[PDB]
A = this chain, B = another copy of it.
């Protein structure tokens, strides 16, 4: 088996996002995907009708079945659904500090439909921020996590909250053709790029395969520049 990325992600039946997108991205990165499903959502391209969040017990049962069997090198999270599941993931990560971890701070669906109570989820994410090898917020997620509207100030706030590295997707350098991404490591700009961007799972795959953070981010852009 290839190095494995274990994904704590929700299921989108329409196949536009969620663990399906994780599987597609990780396969294309060259790694193997394993899945601990956090929720069965009821949604399509237009709206979210609702979701059934996985219990913390069933979430950890899925994850722990993978541990010891597959060569897990990295964890990726997307939709977690509940504060219980955020806490369960933190528990899992603290039991395995040797795993890398890519935090994609999903708060809402592509359609804008609810994937949980944002106020309580934002507060719960505080626990996961310092555990991540990389956090990948878009500009909306960045502001929600920090309560700061200025992008520069919000980025610094994330580092004050314990972030190790942050890939901010979008911002003042965007155009009709590209979203500009900025990679910060320990509060400093490390790479400033673009992307013709769901990058978390691909990056996780490259990290599992032994890439440096900068090399993983670059590969993910190259992948999309061919996608």
Q: Are B49 and A34 in contact (CB under 8 A)?
A: no
Q: Mark A43-86, 1 if CB is under 8 A from B, else 0.
A: 11110010010100010011101101110000000000000000
Q: Are B37 and A49 in contact (CB under 8 A)?
A: no
**With contact pairs A15-B23, A44-B69, A70-B14 given, residues A61 and B49 touching in the complex (Cβ less than 8 Å):** yes
Q: Which residue of B lies closest to A44 (CB)?
A: B69
Please state the number of chain copies in the assembly.
2
CA distance A113 to B21 in the complex (A): 28
Q: Are B20 and A33 in contact (CB under 8 A)?
A: yes
CA distance A42 to B60 in the complex (A): 10
- Asked whether any CB of chain B lies closer than 8 Å to the CB of A91, the reply is no
Contacts of A220 in B (CB 8 A): none
CA distance A4 to B15 in the complex (A): 10
> B20, B34, B63: which contacts A15 (Cβ < 8 A)?
B34
CA distance A205 to B65 in the complex (A): 30
Give the shortest distance, in Å, between A187 (CB) and chain B (any CB).
36
Q: Are B34 and A13 in contact (CB under 8 A)?
A: yes
- Asked whether any CB of chain B lies closer than 8 Å to the CB of A11, the reply is yes
Contacts of A63 in B (CB 8 A): 13
Give the shortest distance, in Å, between A70 (CB) and chain B (any CB).
6
Interface residues of A (CB under 8 A from B): 4, 11-15, 20, 23-24, 27, 32-37, 40, 42-46, 49, 52, 54, 58, 61-63, 65-66, 68-70
Some 30 contacts from A to B, beta carbons below 8 A apart, are A11-B35, A13-B34, A13-B35, A13-B36, A13-B37, A13-B63, A13-B65, A14-B34, A14-B65, A14-B66, A14-B69, A14-B70, A15-B23, A15-B35, A20-B23, A20-B33, A23-B23, A23-B24, A40-B58, A42-B61, A44-B65, A44-B66, A44-B69, A44-B70, A45-B69, A45-B70, A46-B69, A49-B61, A49-B65, A52-B58
